[PDB]
CSV table of C-alpha atoms and ligand atoms in Angstrom, one decimal:
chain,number,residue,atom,x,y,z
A,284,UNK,CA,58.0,63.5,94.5
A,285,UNK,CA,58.4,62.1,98.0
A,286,UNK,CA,58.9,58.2,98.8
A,287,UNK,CA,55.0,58.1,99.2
A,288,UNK,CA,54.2,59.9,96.4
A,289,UNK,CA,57.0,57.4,93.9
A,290,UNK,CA,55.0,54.6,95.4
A,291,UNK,CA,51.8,55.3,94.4
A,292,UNK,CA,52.8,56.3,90.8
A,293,UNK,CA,54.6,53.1,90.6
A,294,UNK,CA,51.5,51.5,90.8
A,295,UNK,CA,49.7,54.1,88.7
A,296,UNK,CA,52.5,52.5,86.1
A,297,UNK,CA,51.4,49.0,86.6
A,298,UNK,CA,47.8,48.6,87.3
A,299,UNK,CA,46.6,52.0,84.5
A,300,UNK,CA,49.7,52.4,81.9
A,301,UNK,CA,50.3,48.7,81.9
A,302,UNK,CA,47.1,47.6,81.0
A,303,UNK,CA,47.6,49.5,77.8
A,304,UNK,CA,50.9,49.5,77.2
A,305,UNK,CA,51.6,46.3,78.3
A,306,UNK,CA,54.3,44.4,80.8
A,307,UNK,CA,56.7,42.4,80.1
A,308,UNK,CA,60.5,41.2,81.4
A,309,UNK,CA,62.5,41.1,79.0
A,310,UNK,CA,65.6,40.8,81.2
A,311,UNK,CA,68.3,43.2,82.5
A,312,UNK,CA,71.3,41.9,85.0
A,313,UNK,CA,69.4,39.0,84.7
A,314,UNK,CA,67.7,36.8,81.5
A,315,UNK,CA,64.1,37.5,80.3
A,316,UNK,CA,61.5,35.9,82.0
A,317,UNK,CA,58.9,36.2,79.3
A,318,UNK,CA,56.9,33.1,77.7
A,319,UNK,CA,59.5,33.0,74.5
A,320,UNK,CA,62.7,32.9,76.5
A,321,UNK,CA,61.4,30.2,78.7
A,322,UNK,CA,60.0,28.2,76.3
A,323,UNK,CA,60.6,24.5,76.3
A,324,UNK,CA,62.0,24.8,79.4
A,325,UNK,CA,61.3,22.3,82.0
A,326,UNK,CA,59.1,24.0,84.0
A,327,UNK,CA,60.4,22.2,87.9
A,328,UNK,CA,63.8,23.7,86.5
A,329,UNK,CA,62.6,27.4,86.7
A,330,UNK,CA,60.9,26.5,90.1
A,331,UNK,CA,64.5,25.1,91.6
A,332,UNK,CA,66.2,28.2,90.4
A,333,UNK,CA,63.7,30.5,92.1
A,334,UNK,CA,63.9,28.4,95.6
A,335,UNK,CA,67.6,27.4,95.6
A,336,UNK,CA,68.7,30.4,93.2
A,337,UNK,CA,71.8,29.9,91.7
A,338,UNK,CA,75.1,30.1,92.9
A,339,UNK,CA,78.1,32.6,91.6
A,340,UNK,CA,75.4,34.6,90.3
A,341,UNK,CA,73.0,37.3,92.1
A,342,UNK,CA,69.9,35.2,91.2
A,343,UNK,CA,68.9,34.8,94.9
A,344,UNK,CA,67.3,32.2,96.8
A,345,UNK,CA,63.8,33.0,97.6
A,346,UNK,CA,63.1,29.4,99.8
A,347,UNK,CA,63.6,31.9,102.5
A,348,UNK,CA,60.6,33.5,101.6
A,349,UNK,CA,58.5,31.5,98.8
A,350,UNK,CA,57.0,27.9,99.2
A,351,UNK,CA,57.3,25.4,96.7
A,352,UNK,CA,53.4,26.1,95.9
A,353,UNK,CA,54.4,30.2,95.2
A,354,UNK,CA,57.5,29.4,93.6
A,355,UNK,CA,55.3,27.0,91.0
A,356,UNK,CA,52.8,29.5,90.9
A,357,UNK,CA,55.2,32.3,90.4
A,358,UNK,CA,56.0,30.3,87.3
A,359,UNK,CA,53.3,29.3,85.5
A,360,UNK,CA,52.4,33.0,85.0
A,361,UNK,CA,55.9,33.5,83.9
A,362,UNK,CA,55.0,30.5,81.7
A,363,UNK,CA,51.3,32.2,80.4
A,364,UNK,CA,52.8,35.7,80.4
A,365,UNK,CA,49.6,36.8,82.5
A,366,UNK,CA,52.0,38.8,85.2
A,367,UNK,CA,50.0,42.1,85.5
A,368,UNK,CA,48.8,42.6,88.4
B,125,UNK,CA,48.0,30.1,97.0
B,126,UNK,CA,45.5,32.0,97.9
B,127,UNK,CA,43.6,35.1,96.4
B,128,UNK,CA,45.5,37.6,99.2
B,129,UNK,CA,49.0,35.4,98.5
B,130,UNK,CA,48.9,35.5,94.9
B,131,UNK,CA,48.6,39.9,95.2
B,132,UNK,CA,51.7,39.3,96.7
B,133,UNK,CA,53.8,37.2,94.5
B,134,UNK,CA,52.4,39.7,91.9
B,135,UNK,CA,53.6,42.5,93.3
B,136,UNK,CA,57.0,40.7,94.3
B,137,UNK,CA,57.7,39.3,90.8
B,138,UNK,CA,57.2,43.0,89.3
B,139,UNK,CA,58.8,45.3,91.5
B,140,UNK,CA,61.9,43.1,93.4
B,141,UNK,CA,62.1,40.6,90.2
B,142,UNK,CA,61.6,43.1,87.7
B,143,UNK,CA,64.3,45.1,88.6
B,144,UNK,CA,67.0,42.9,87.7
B,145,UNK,CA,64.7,41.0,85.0
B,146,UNK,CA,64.5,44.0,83.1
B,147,UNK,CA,60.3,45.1,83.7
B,148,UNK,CA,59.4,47.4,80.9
B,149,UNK,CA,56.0,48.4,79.6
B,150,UNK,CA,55.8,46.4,76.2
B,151,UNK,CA,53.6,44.2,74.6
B,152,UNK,CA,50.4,45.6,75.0
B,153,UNK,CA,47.8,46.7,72.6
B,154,UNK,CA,49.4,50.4,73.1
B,155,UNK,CA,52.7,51.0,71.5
B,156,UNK,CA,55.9,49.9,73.7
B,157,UNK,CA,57.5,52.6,76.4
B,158,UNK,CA,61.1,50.7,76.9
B,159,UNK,CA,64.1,52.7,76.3
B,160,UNK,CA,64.8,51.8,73.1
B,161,UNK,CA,61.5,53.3,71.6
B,162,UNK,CA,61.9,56.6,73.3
B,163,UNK,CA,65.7,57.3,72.6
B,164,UNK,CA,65.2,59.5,70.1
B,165,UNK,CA,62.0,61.6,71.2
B,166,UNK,CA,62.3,65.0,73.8
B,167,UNK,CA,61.8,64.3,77.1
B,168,UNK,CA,59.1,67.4,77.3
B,169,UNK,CA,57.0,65.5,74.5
B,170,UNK,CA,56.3,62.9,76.4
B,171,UNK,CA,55.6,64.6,79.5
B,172,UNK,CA,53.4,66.6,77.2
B,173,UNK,CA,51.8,63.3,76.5
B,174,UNK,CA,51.3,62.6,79.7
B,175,UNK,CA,50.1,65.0,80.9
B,176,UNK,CA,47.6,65.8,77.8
B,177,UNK,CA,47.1,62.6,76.2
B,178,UNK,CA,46.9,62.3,72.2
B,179,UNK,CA,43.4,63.0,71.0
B,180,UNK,CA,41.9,61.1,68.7
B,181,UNK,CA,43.5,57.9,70.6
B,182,UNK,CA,42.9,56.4,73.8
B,183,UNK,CA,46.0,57.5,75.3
B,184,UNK,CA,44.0,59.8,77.9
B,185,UNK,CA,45.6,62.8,79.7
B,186,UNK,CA,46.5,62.6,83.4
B,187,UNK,CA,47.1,66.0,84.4
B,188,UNK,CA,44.1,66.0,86.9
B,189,UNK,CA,45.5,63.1,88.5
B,190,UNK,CA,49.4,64.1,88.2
B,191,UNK,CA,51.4,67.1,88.5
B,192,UNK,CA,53.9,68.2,86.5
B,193,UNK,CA,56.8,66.7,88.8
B,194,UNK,CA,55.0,63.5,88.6
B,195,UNK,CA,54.7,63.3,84.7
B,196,UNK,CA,58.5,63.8,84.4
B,197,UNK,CA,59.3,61.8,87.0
B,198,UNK,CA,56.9,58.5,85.5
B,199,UNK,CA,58.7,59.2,82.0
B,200,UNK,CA,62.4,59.1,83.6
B,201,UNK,CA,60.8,55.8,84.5
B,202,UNK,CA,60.6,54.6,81.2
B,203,UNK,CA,63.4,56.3,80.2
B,204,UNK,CA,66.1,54.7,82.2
B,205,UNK,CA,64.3,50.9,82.8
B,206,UNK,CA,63.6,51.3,86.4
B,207,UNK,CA,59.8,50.2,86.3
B,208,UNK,CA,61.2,48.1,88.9
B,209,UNK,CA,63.1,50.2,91.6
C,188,LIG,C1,44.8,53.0,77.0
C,188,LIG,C2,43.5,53.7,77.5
C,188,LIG,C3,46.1,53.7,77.5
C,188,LIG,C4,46.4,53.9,78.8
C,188,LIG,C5,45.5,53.7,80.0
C,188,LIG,C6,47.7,54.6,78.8
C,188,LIG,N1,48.2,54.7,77.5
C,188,LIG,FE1,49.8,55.7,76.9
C,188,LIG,N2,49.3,55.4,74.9
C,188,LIG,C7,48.2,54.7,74.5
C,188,LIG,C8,48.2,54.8,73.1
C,188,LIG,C9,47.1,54.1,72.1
C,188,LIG,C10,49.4,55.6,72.7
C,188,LIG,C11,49.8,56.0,71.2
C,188,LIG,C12,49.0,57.2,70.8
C,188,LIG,C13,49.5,57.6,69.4
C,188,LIG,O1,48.8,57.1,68.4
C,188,LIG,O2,50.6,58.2,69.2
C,188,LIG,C14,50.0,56.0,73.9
C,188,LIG,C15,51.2,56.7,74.0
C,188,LIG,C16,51.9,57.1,75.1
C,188,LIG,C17,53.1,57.9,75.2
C,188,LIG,C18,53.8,58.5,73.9
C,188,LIG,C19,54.8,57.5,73.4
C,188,LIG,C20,55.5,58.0,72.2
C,188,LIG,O3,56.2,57.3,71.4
C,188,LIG,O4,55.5,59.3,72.0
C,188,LIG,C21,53.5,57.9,76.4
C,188,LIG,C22,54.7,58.7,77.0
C,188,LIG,C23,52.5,57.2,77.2
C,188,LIG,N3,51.5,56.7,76.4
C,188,LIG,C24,52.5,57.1,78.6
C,188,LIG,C25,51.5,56.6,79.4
C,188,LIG,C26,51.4,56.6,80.8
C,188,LIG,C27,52.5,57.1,81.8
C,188,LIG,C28,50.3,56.0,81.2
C,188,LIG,C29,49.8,55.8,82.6
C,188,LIG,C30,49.7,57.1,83.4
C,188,LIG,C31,49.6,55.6,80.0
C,188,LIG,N4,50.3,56.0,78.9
C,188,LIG,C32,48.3,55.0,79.9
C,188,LIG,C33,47.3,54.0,75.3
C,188,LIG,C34,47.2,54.1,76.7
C,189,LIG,C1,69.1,40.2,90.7
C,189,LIG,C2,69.5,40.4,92.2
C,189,LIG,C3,68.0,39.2,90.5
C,189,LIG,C4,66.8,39.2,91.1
C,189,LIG,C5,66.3,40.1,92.3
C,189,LIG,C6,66.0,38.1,90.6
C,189,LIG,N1,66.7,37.5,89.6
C,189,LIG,FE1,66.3,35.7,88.8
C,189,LIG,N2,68.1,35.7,87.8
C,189,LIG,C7,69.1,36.7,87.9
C,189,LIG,C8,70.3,36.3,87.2
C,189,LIG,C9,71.6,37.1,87.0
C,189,LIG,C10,70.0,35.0,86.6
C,189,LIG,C11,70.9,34.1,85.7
C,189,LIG,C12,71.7,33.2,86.6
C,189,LIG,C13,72.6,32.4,85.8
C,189,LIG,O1,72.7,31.1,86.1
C,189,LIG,O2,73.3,32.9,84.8
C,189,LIG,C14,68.6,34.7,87.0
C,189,LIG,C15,67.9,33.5,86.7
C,189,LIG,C16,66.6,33.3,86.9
C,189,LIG,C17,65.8,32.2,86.3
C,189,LIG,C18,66.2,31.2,85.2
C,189,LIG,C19,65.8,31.7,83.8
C,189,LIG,C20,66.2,30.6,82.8
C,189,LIG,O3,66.3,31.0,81.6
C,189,LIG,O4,66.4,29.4,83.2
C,189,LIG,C21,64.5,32.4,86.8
C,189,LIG,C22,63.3,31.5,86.4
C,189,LIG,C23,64.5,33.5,87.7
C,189,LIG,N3,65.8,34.0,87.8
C,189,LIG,C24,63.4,33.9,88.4
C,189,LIG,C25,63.4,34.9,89.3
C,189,LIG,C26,62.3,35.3,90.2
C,189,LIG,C27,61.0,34.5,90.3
C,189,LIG,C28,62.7,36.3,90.9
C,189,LIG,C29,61.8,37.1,92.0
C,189,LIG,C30,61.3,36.1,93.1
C,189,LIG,C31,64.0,36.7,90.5
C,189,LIG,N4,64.4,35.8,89.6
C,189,LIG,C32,64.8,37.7,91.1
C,189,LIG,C33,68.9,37.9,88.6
C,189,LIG,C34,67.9,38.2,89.5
């Protein structure tokens, strides 16, 4: 399948298989982000690590892109677990 | 944010976050599709399943809508963790 074609069956993975199945991230190069691994967790600390990122480490800083209102937001459904789309 | 902003952030936090957050379809009411609960089952049974669902479960078939290429190609998905790309 062309770049098109992985595109659209990316989605198909998100929107039909995970409704069923279920998403979650339960962390790779970087730590889960699912409601039990942040629990407890002052919740303006997850927000400064998504705008600021943090350092020595390839978490990124997304103030380049993300307000402070998406960062939050971004968060709280990191927080509920409610991230499909 | 508003209803078009928060598509966004959705779509940002599961395919450019996901990737190094680890995305995986888990925790649904369907059984989990990680790595770790396919190692040990062929890759052809689950394209298989794919591509004819399981009767007598809602797990419904998608060959109509996918071809062969795009079964295999959705399971490597799974397979390897790259929900995210
Ligand atoms: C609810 C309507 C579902 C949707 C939509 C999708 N899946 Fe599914 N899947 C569902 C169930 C209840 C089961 C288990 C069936 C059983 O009792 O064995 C499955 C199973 C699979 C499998 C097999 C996993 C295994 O361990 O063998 C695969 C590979 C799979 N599902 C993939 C898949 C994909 C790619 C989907 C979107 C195209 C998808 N499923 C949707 C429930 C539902
Ligand atoms: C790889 C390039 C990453 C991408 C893209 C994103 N994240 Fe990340 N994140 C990554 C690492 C390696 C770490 C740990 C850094 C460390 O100090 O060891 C993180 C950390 C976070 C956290 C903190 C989690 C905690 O338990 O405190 C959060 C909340 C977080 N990252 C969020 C986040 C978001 C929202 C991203 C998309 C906008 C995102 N990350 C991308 C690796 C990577």
């Amino acid at each position: 399948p062309d770049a098109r074609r992985q595109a659209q069956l990316r989605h198909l993975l998100l929107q039909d298989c995970g409704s069923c199945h279920g998403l979650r991230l339960t962390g790779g190069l970087g730590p889960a982000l699912t409601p039990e691994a942040l629990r407890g967790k002052p919740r303006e600390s997850l927000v400064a690590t998504v705008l600021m990122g943090r350092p020595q480490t390839p978490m990124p800083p997304w103030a380049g892109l993300l307000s402070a209102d998406d960062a939050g937001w971004l968060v709280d459904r990191l927080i509920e677990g409610e991230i499909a789309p």
